[PDB]
Amino acid sequence: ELGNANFENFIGATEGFSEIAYQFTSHILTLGYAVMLAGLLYFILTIKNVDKKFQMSNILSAVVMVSAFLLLYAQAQNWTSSFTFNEEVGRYFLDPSGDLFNNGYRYLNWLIDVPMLLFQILFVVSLTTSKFSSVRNQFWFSGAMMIITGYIGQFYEVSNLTAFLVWGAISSAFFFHILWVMKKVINEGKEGISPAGQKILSNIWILFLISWTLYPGAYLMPYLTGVDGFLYSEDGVMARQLVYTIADVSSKVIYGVLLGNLAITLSK
Amino acid sequence: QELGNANFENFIGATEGFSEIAYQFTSHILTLGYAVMLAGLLYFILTIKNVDKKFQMSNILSAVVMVSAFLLLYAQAQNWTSSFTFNEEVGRYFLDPSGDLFNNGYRYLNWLIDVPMLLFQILFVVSLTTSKFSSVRNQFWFSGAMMIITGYIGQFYEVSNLTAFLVWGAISSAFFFHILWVMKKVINEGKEGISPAGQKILSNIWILFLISWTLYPGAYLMPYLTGVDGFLYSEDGVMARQLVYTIADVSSKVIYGVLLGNLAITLS
Amino acid sequence: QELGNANFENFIGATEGFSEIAYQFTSHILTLGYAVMLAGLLYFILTIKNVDKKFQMSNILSAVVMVSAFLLLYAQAQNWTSSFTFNEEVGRYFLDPSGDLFNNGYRYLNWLIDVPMLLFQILFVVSLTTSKFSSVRNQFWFSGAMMIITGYIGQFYEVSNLTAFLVWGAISSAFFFHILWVMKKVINEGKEGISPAGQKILSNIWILFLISWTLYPGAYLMPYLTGVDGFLYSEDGVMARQLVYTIADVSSKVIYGVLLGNLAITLS
Amino acid sequence: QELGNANFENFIGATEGFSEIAYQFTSHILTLGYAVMLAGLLYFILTIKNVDKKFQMSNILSAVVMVSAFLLLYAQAQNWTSSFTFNEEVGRYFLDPSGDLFNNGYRYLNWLIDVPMLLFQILFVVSLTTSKFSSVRNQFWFSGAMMIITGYIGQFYEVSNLTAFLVWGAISSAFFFHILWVMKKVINEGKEGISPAGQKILSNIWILFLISWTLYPGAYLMPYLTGVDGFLYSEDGVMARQLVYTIADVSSKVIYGVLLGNLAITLSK
Amino acid sequence: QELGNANFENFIGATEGFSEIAYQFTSHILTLGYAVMLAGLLYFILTIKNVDKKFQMSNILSAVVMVSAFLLLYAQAQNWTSSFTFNEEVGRYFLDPSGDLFNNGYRYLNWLIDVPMLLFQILFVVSLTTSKFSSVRNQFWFSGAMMIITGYIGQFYEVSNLTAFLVWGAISSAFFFHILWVMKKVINEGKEGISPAGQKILSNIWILFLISWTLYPGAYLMPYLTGVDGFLYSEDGVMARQLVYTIADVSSKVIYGVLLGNLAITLSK
Ligand SMILES: *C/C=C(C)/C=C/C=C(C)/C=C/C1=C(C)CCCC1(C)C
Ligand SMILES: *C/C=C(C)/C=C/C=C(C)/C=C/C1=C(C)CCCC1(C)C
Ligand SMILES: *C/C=C(C)/C=C/C=C(C)/C=C/C1=C(C)CCCC1(C)C
Ligand SMILES: *C/C=C(C)/C=C/C=C(C)/C=C/C1=C(C)CCCC1(C)C
Ligand SMILES: CCCCCCCCCCCCCCCCCCCC
Ligand code: NA
Ligand code: NA
Ligand code: NA
Ligand code: NA
Ligand code: NA
Structure with missing residues (x-):
């Protein structure tokens, strides 16, 4: 009786995880938080490389990094504490003393x-x-609306598929609004800057689009091959956390680096 | 089972237990709290040289608060996860005494x-x-000091002795009203002789102070705001209490310091 | 149930156990202690450039102390929570030997x-x-050094051998009085040739030094200040001892350094 | 017992177990690794203002690497101590599955x-x-990226499937040789137009790069460098693998950054 | 309970166990060690700009040693508390193998x-x-390097093979004497051409170096300094060894760096 629990717990409590799946998920989360701490150091050590009116950006990048390290460090531990090895079969099954694994830690911190x-x-x-x-x-x-609706929705990704999908759509509405406003922002920012800054801004637009779209992909990951599909397995858990790590790195670290390069180019 | 002078979270967790949503949400909200606190520390440290020297003390004090807050919330987060353990037979988190009883007094003394x-x-x-x-x-x-100490004494009896609970709460509320009076006086005097922008900032600071500080006695009274055996005397009440705590913490510390820094900038 | 040369907290916890209020208060007060120490470290680092170069060593030394203090009070906090475990049948925290016996000599050597x-x-x-x-x-x-070492030897016998306890305490008190004499000389000489404001600060420093340092032999004698089988030979005595330790730590370290820094500013 | 696609440390520890020397030495060497990484972090941060501005980026990148390395090695240290527990009856550390299986992949992804x-x-x-x-x-x-990913896939089969192990290792070695080629090009071009002292520093950097990076496929192949049922398919091989990992980490990260910083110093004015 | 090539602390704790005073004192002294190391790190960082630029490297290198030291002592502190657990029946801490055996080699490699x-x-x-x-x-x-490695090999046999213990100790002592020789030469040459105050500081530094460094072979030999089955082959010997380790660590690292910084100040313009 798992209740309103994420599908990682169902997969781990029924089939369990092989060595490769468990170890890869742990490795990808470890790499995530390592990237975040390294990026924090990078953004702090490069503050004086831009003009003063741009350093705020740097600071905010650093701010973001802090949050992510802490989450992906906690989440990391969470993974390893929620699943333990059974020597009789050679697989990692759900260990309830380490609590049920939940992705919601990421939502609120967004x-x-x-x-x-x-x-x-x-x-x-x-x-x-x-x-x-x-x-x-x-x-x-x-x-805020997007994050809160998606956070409510992910609690029902196995218990109530209908609520899962409904909250996902209500979140995607606000997601589209964010995308529209951001496209407006970038088009307005391209005006009156050298072609190098315009190139950087177009790259930022492409990266923003892809990396931000990756997150509802991870939201739907267990069902992208339908019910009882190839992705409703340990492969789907691996894919979910891998997409999470890729999107985290891209939307935070690389986004901040491109913003810093743009600030450098616009500096006198 | 005998629990003594313990918070009502322990009683709910020992009798009904917590569902996945309640337990996971409480953990997520405490994690978000301490993450917010460490990111503000960096913010407040990194923006010190943005104001005249005479105002920088404010920044420093903000950073000080941040440190305290972070540590406490971090500890408190851990405590939550150590006090309640998943029971697989029914699928609910129950009190785990080997992890100690859950107590909110950690906040109180750190105030x-x-x-x-x-x-x-x-x-x-x-x-x-x-x-x-x-x-x-x-x-x-x-x-x-008097407010904090009286409320700290009172919260130990929120279940074992409602009379002492309410008496200490009222004694604390007296000092709270005195604090509100002195703060209103301070804000009114600070408005005198400054620019209109600083006056608007001070008005915002007063409104924020009022609401965010009033939220704390709200969390104090949370389990009984719907009466004895009411709707909030449940896991919903535990969620609500920790959510109110986190909202009040963020508003009264981070946003308060940020508005103070904006005021310091406009006065420079 | 033989404990040997152990502190009286272990005896109280092994015979009567601690109530929720006592255990929780001791944990909260130790947590507040180490939080105060880390915040003071941040403060003393951030206020270095507020005084002339010749005084900055004071700041550094303050920061040094902070580091030490933090680590021990963090460790000691952990030790408390690991040494006493909840018994549900009666609802009280009793000695848990798998967490090691509780000992306050960590502080001594760190002094x-x-x-x-x-x-x-x-x-x-x-x-x-x-x-x-x-x-x-x-x-x-x-x-x-002599004071600390003799008191450290003495505190191991506070229950197992009262004679050694008191004899080592007196041997320590001799060096304590020597320290007080030399400090009085130093403060009187420092008053000579400075402004009245610095003299007032120095007088406050002397009063603070006297009271806060005298508090430590008070915590040393705490379990017997009401005689054998007295009121303080209980969990109340444990609370009082750790509370006095926290008050003395804060006063003699953080507030002492702050007053020294204010003096350094007035002399600059 | 069934272990699946696990590293050979788990098999050795589950069948023969580790002696006190083997377990203690592996723990000490991993601890030394992460300590070295944190000390190098401090060094590279503190020596930033010792070079001209245009070179300071190098320092920063070194520090970045240091952070990663430290964190990873720290985790790995813990992992070792969590996977093997002392059995008083025989006097040896055996696999403890409640601590998870030991896996070197933590390094690979962090690369x-x-x-x-x-x-x-x-x-x-x-x-x-x-x-x-x-x-x-x-x-x-x-x-x-290709080298790291292919080697990471391959190392999961170092016991369960030697064929995939070797095939993925060779595919990785291809990209490794390409990297060596490009690096030699970079060093030859960098030697042009700088003082002889900087050229000597570049030569030392090239030798260090070559040896320290070649050490990693050596640790990859370690359990089989003396053949099946050989001398290295033992706790001695586990010790050797972690020792080679630590030596390669120190050389290729800390000493590499230090030599780069010395070069930057000689080029500064 | 067969322990093999393990340090004598494990044998004492497995046969007699440790009293409350012994266990608590060892834990306190290791805790004090790592606290001192972190405080010294802070001190050496904050006092960098107190000397001319050419001397600041000393400061940096001192903090590097403080990082290393801190980490190691922290680990070692944890290890002590994890290896010995209270037995309520008799009131003594005995060896707890689930926490691993206690080993001093953590220090050696970090040297x-x-x-x-x-x-x-x-x-x-x-x-x-x-x-x-x-x-x-x-x-x-x-x-x-030779001194450290030979002593590290030797210390694993301090109980299981006294002969190898002493042979490796003597081989290490040879390199130790060589180090003392080179250091005496360095101090004599450094005295030349500086003010009398710097010469006095250098003399003090030499005395400190000699005593504090000689303390380490003392801790190496500690359990046998009173003969076989002597007084120091007890929990008293364990306390004495860890206390000597802590005194030597503080003296040879923190106080050594402080005296070096004072010399650098006296040489500063
Ligand atoms: C960052 C924390 C802050 C600003 C805390 C503020 C605390 C209060 C306003 C405390 C209020 C209390 C009462 C008014 C009544 C009941 C008891 C208290 C202690 C919760
Ligand atoms: C930050 C810590 C400080 C200032 C510690 C001060 C310690 C003392 C004043 C020690 C006092 C002692 C006595 C005079 C008698 C009994 C034994 C001692 C060691 C507790
Ligand atoms: C700090 C880490 C560094 C410099 C890592 C370098 C990694 C390599 C040179 C990887 C080499 C590999 C091959 C050449 C073959 C077998 C697989 C690898 C991944 C170990
Ligand atoms: C901070 C640590 C320092 C300065 C360590 C110094 C180590 C030594 C002087 C080592 C000495 C040894 C011998 C002289 C003989 C026996 C073996 C050793 C390794 C303990
Ligand atoms: C130039 C520096 C001069 C230093 C002045 C004295 C400071 C060192 C004091 C060291 C105290 C050591 C006391 C330990 C003695 C052993 C105690 C056994 C129990 C009585
Ligand atoms: Na696990
Ligand atoms: Na839990
Ligand atoms: Na406990
Ligand atoms: Na272990
Ligand atoms: Na223990």
Whole structure:
């Protein structure tokens, strides 16, 4: 009787995880939080490389990094404490004394990362039609609604598939609003800067789109091959956490590095 | 089973147990709390040289608070996960005494750091007119100490003795109202003789102070706000209490320090 | 149930056990202690550039002390929670030998850092007149070392051998009085030739030093301050001992360093 | 008992067990590794202002690597101590499955930080002549990623499937040789137009790079370097593997960064 | 309970066990050690700008040793408390194998950081006259490595094979005497051409070096300094060994760095 639990727990409590699956999930989470701490150091040590009016961006990047390290460190431990080896079969099964594994740790902490990540670009690009405050408030409201609806939804990814999908769609609405506003921001920021900055901004747009789209992909991962599909297995757990790590790295570290390069180019 | 003078979370977890949603949400919200606290430390450290020297003390005090907050919430997070263990037969988290009983007093005593410093730092940005700096500081510190100590005594009896619970709560509320009075005086005097932007910032600071500080007696009273054997005397009440604690912590510490720093910038 | 040369906390916890209030309060007070120490470390680092170069050593030494203090009070906190475990049948925390016996001598040996450095740092702010710097330093260090070592030997027999307890305590008290004499000389010489404000600060420093340092033999004698089988030979005595330890730690380290820094500012 | 696609440390520890020397030495060497990494982090941060601004990026990248290394090695240290428990009846440490199986893959994925950055940072000290900066960088990054991923896949089968082990190892060795080729090109171009002292430093850097990076496939092959049922298919092989890992880590990260910093110093004005 | 090539602390704790005073004191002394190391790290970082630039390297290298030391002592502290558990029936702490056996080798390998760096940093303050910098450095590093490695091999047999114990100890003592010789030469050359105050500081540094470094073979021999089945082959010997280790660590690292910094200040303009 698992109740409103994530599907990792069902897979681990029925079939269990082979050595490769368990060890790979642990390794990918470890790499995630290591990347986050290294990026924190990188952003702190490069603050004076940009003009003062851009250093805020750097700071915010650092801020984000802090949150992520702590989460992906906790989450990491969580994984290894939720599943233990059974010598009789050679697989890792759910160990209830280490609690049920839950991805929600990431959702609430996005309440830090999503606003901040949306906010810092407004310290590097210059708006030509929109108001700074209006864009900021839209970003924050839509991100909060998206995160909260998705966080409520993921609790029912096995118990109540209907609620899962409904909350996912209600979240995707705010996601589309965020995407529209961000495209507006980047198009307005391209105006009046050298072609190098425009190239950096187009790269930022592409990276933003892909890496941010990766997250609902991980949301739906156990069902992307339908019920009782190839992805509703330990392969799906591996894929979920791998996509999470890729999207984390891209949307945080690489995004901050491209913002820093843009700030360097715009600096005098 | 005999629990003695323990918080109502322990009683709920020993009788009904917690569902996956309740337990996981409480853990996530405490994790988010301490993550927010360490990211603000960096923020407040990294933005020290953004204000005139005379205001920088505020920043320092903010950082101090952050440290305290982080540590406490980190500890508190761990304590939660160690006090409740999954029971597979029914699929619910029950009290685990080998991990010690859960107690909110960890917050209360640590407020002995937070409450004075928070009340102290505003006196490094605004300039008093008819009030005396040392008088305001001593009143703040004495009233805060009394409030914290009386509430800390009272919360131990939230289940074992409702009468002492309420009596200590009222005794604490007296000092709380005194603090609100002195703070209103301080804000009104600080408004005198400053720019309109600083006046708007001070108004926002007063509103934030009022709401976020009132949230704490709300969390104190949470299990009984729907009466004896009411709806909030459940795992829903535990979730609500920790959520209110986290919202109040973030608002009264991080956002309060950020608004104070904005005020310091406009005055520079 | 033979405990040997163990502290009286272990005897109380092995015979009567601790109630929820007693155990939780001891844990909270130790947690507050180490939080205060880390916050003080941050404060003393951040306020280094507030005084002239010649005084900055004081800050550094303060920070040094903080480090030591933090680590021990963090360790000691852990030790408390690991040494006593909840018994559900009666609802009380009893001695848990798998977590090791509780011992307060961790503090003693760590005073081998604190006592010299604290006594040393005042010699970087005040200017001696008739006394020799190196003589004062050597007297401070030797007397402090002897005091700490003799008290550390004595505290192991606070239950198993009252005679050794009291004899070693008196041997320590001799060196304590020597330290008090030398400190009075140092403060009186430092008052000479400075402004009245610095003299008032020095008087406050002397009062604080006296009270806060006298608090330590008080915690040493705590279980017997009401006689054998007295009121304090209970969990109440355990609470009182750890509370006195925390008050003395905060006063003699953090507030002492803050007053020294204020003096350094007035002398700058 | 069934272990599946697990490293050979688990098989040795589950069948023969480890003596006190083997277990204690492995723990000590991993501890020394992560201690060295943290000390190097401190060093590279503290010596940033010792070189001209244009070279300071190198320092930063070193520090970045250090962080990764420290964290990873720290975890791995814990993992060792969690996988093997003393049995008083025989006097040997045996596999403890409640602590998870021991796996070297923690290193491999973390090389996804180490290998690019290490290859990247030298491009902030030396000046290329005929090669394009971005071309060299992209080649380094792609070849390193492929090498790491293929070796990481291969090492899971070092006991359960020797054929896949060797095939993935060879596929990885291809990209390793490409990396060596590009690095030799970089060193030859960097020697041009700098003082003889900097050229000597570059020669030492090339020798160190070659040896220290070649040490890693050696640790990959360690249990079989004396054949099946050989001398190295024992606790001696486990000790040798972790010792080679630690020596290669120190040499290829800390000493590499120190030599790069000395080169940057001689090039500074 | 067969323990094999294990340190004598495990034998004492497995046969007689430790009393409350002995166990608590060993734990306190290790805790004090790592606390001292972290505080010294803070001190050496915060006092960097107190000396001329050319001397600041000393400061840096001191903090590197403080990092290493800190980590090791922290680990060792944990290890002690994890290896011995209270038995309520008799009131003594006995060996607990689930926490691993206690081993001092953690220190030894970490000396591979401490011993070279400590010997290196003095060469950033004093100026040699007749000796060559690189020759002194190479001699220091080689002799220190050999000393550490031979003693590390030997200490595993302090109970199981006293003969190998003593043979490895003597082989190590040879390199120790070589180090003392080179250090005496270095101090004599550094005294030349500096003010009398710096010469007095150098004399004090030499005395400190001699005593604090000689303390380590003392801890090596501690259980047998009173003969076979002597007084020191007891829990008293365990306390004495760890206390000597802590005193030697503090003296040879923190106080050594402080005296070096004082010398650097007196040499500073
Ligand atoms: C960061 C923490 C802050 C600002 C804490 C503030 C605490 C209070 C306003 C305490 C309030 C209390 C009462 C008014 C009544 C009941 C008891 C208390 C202690 C919760
Ligand atoms: C930060 C720690 C400080 C300032 C410690 C001070 C310690 C003392 C004043 C020690 C006092 C002792 C006695 C005078 C008698 C009994 C034994 C002692 C060691 C507790
Ligand atoms: C700090 C870590 C570094 C520099 C890692 C370097 C890694 C390699 C040179 C990897 C080599 C591999 C092969 C050449 C063959 C077998 C598989 C590998 C992954 C071990
Ligand atoms: C911080 C650590 C230091 C300075 C360590 C120094 C180590 C030694 C002087 C080692 C000495 C040894 C011998 C002289 C003989 C026996 C074996 C050793 C390794 C303990
Ligand atoms: C130039 C520096 C002069 C230093 C002055 C004296 C400071 C060192 C004092 C060391 C005290 C050591 C006391 C330990 C003695 C052994 C105790 C056994 C129990 C009585
Ligand atoms: Na596990
Ligand atoms: Na739990
Ligand atoms: Na406990
Ligand atoms: Na183990
Ligand atoms: Na223990």
